[PDB]
Structure formats: C-alpha cells, structure tokens
C-alpha cells in the first residue's frame, strides 16, 4: 500500500531530512568510483544475485553503518549502459551491523534505525545512471541522501500536503504513515 516508515524511538523527534542527512554523513562516501571499486571492500552484494536481487546491501568502510535496498533490482555491471542499477525500488533500510547474504536468510541489520517501504519507484535500464533508482541508491553509497529525500518528500506530500521530508517521525506516526519501535 502507501509509503510506510518504521523508526526507533531514538529518532521520534527528528525530521526525516535531518535523520537522513545525518545517517549519510556518518555512513560516508565509500568511494565506489572509477578505479576505486574494490571487491570485498565497497562493492556491496546482491541477494540472491548474481547482479540482480530482491536486495542490494552495503556496509560502510568507516563504521558499522549499512543499508539494504529492496525490490526487484538489476545491475548492468560492465554491460551497456555500464554500472547502472535499475528496476523496482520498494524499500530502503538503514542502520548498523549488516548480517547475512545470499547463502543465509537474506541480508538483515542487527540494529535497524529506520526503514522506508512501499517507495513505489521504478526506473528503466534506458536511463542508465540518470535513472531515479540509480541516483537514490548511489547517493547513499556516496554520502549524499538528496535523491532519497526528494522521493520521500514527493510521496509524503501526496499523502497530505502538510507532510514533507521536513516532518518528524512522530508526526508521521500520528498520520498512520510511520510506526515506532523501542531502540535495540
């Protein structure tokens, strides 16, 4: 159904924008860039794979911060248009301590802080790295959550014009969009 948000009560009073800007700055720019993509270090991984998955997950190299992108995702790797993540992006989960993978019961976060589901985003292969899905996820890899913020802002304003990326998680909970969980 519509955009749904889970959040630890640690962040009840934070705006979605302030939370995301802060999380991104922490996670940092992993430098998944030309000549700097290094296997076992900053590539991330797909479940079930190979370069497609219901999940793409990546841990920060500077901390235990990690994200899991979920949906029906495809990555072109070296083939035309190269290094494009496209397909359906349904969810983004943010937190610390990535566990699991393709051999396990999928990727998970030991400490999930915030998750966004029913994002409703699709991008065609045809846009390459100009596609919205690509920009959303690559943004989170490069320490810049602007693209994700823009998508969430649009979804929230469609729910109600008083709601935006600059609304707090508690405000979104009263409006039935978000749901709190104790910090664990």
TrEMBL record:
Name of the protein: Heme acquisition protein HasAp
GO molecular function terms attached to this record: metal ion binding
Binding residue positions for heme b 3: 75, 129
Encoding gene, per UniProt annotation: hasAp
Pfam families documented for this protein: HasA (PF06438)
Residues noted as binding heme b 1 in the record, renumbered to the chain: 32, 35, 75
Positions bound to heme: 32, 75
Gene3D superfamilies: Haem-binding HasA
Keywords: Heme, Iron, Metal-binding
Residues holding heme b 2: 75, 83, 129, 138
InterPro entries for this protein: HasA_haem-bd, HasA_haem-bd_sf
């Amino acid at each position: 159904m519509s955009i749904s948000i889970s959040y630890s009560t640690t962040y009840s009073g934070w705006t979605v924008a302030d939370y995301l800007a802060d999380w991104s700055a922490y996670f940092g720019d992993v430098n998944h860039r030309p000549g700097q993509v290094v296997d076992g270090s900053n590539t991330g991984g797909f479940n079930p794979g190979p370069f497609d998955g219901s999940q793409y997950a990546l841990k920060s190299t500077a901390s235990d911060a990690a994200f899991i992108a979920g949906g029906d995702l495809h990555y072109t790797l070296f083939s035309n248009p190269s290094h494009t993540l496209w397909g359906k992006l349904d969810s983004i989960a943010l937190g610390d301590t990535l566990t699991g993978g393709a051999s396990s019961g999928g990727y998970a976060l030991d400490s999930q802080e915030v998750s966004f589901s029913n994002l409703g985003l699709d991008s065609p292969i045809a846009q390459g790295r100009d596609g919205t899905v690509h920009k959303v996820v690559y943004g989170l890899m490069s320490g810049d959550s602007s693209a994700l913020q823009g998508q969430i802002d649009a979804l929230l304003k469609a729910v109600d014009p008083s709601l935006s990326i600059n609304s707090t998680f508690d405000q979104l909970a009263a409006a039935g969009v978000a749901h709190a969980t104790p910090a664990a």
